[PDB]
Amino acid sequence: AISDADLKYLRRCVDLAREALDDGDEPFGSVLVDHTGTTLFEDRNRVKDGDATAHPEFAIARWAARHLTPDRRARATVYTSGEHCPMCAAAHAWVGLGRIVYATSSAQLGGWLTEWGAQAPVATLPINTVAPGVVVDGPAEELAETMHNLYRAKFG
């Protein structure tokens, strides 16, 4: 299930990814939403200053650990422009966050990166290989070409 409301959040993730690209970082953005539908926290990739672990899903996991009780974490949704790498999927599950919705799969990105000779040093594992209990929805097919464009701008 990717609802109309889900797609709106995913479109905000894409806007954050573009913000990251325009700032010199890599095009990934993510938002954390409460069960009430209140946006709690938003972030984007910040690796350009030297720390390759500065992925927004990871920032969300640590933010949730600090600011939400486990019960609220479990009922929260994370939206992301790109499917959590294994680092971020593992962090998500460790802190006990709930549903993940992503725009493009890590398989999509890995395929595109392979076309450009830009493969990552971390494997493109689907979230549920890393985090078997997490409910995962995605990809949103309507956002494939849009995200491919941002990825190409960075890695192409």
Ligand X SMILES: O=c1nc[nH]c(=O)[nH]1
CA distance 108 to 58: 21
The binder of 28, among Zn ion, ligand X, a second copy, none, by C-beta within 5 to 8 A per type, is ligand X
**Residue 55 near residue 45, CB atoms below 8 Å:** yes
- For position 46 contacting Zn ion by CB under 5 A, the verdict is no
CA distance 108 to 131: 19
x-or-dash pattern for ligand X, window 9-38, by CB under 6 A? -----------------x-x----------
Minimum distance between the CB of residue 4 and a second copy, rounded to whole angstroms?
A: 30
Query: 93-112: which residues touch ligand X (CB under 6 A)?
Result: none
Non-local (6+) Cβ contacts of 121 within 8 A are: none
Minimum distance between the CB of residue 7 and a second copy, rounded to whole angstroms?
A: 28
- For position 82 contacting ligand X by CB under 6 A, the verdict is yes
**Angle formed by the axes of helices 106-116 and 144-155, nearest 10°:** 40
Minimum distance between the CB of residue 21 and ligand X, rounded to whole angstroms?
A: 11
**Residue 124 near residue 111, CB atoms below 8 Å:** no
